[PDB]
From Swiss-Prot:
Domain of life: Eukaryota
Record protein name field: Myoglobin
Gene that produces this protein: MB
Organism (species): Equus caballus
Subunit comment: Monomeric.
One Pfam family recorded for the sequence: Globin
């Protein structure tokens, strides 16, 4: 698990995200799509986006970035006590959206990248450590639900 101190760091970093939820959400998805174009193919409503300029100008992509980070923020504020919040997300990502766990690794990496990119010098080694742990807890608890479903 994470320590009390580590949770405090995680939720302190998250305060940065909440100052511009849509902006952070959009950059996370753009980083995911551009670094891993196979991921874009999982989204029927975003696969029309051919260039980063189109992605950047998509108001619906910003909207979905808001949905995504609002859900993740809810989970992180549970500090590991997130079974009821996490299970349904795990289940829709495996069963409906067909998202391999690797793509969750990709988006964890993208969040870390975006945090550094948006807050250069304001996302210290201790904070990266804490947030990385939170994100591996998230990914690991989803992977358990994936195994249950036998989903690959
Ligand atoms: C931080 C991790 C993630 C969070 C918090 C998250 C959250 C959400 C939420 C809250 C929804 C809407 C409700 C639902 O369908 O369950 C959603 C939909 C969706 N998610 Fe994610 N997700 C994450 C990772 C991913 C990844 C890595 C992919 C890979 C492509 C993905 C693909 C999708 C797709 C295709 C939908 C349907 C979008 C639509 O057409 O409306 N998600 N996600």
């Amino acid at each position: 698990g994470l320590s009390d101190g580590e949770w405090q760091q995680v939720l302190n970093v998250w305060g940065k995200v909440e100052a511009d939820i849509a902006g952070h959400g959009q950059e996370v998805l753009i980083r995911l799509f551009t670094g891993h174009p196979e991921t874009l193919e999982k989204f029927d409503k975003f696969k029309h986006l051919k260039t980063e300029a189109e992605m950047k100008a998509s108001e619906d992509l910003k909207k979905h970035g808001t949905v995504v980070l609002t859900a993740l923020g809810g989970i992180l504020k549970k500090k590991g006590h997130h079974e009821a919040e996490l299970k349904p997300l795990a289940q829709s990502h495996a069963t409906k959206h067909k998202i391999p766990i690797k793509y969750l690794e990709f988006i964890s990496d993208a969040i870390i990248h975006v945090l550094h990119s948006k807050h250069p010098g304001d996302f210290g080694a201790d904070a990266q450590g804490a947030m990385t742990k939170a994100l591996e807890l998230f990914r690991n608890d989803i992977a358990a639900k994936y195994k249950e479903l036998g989903f690959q």
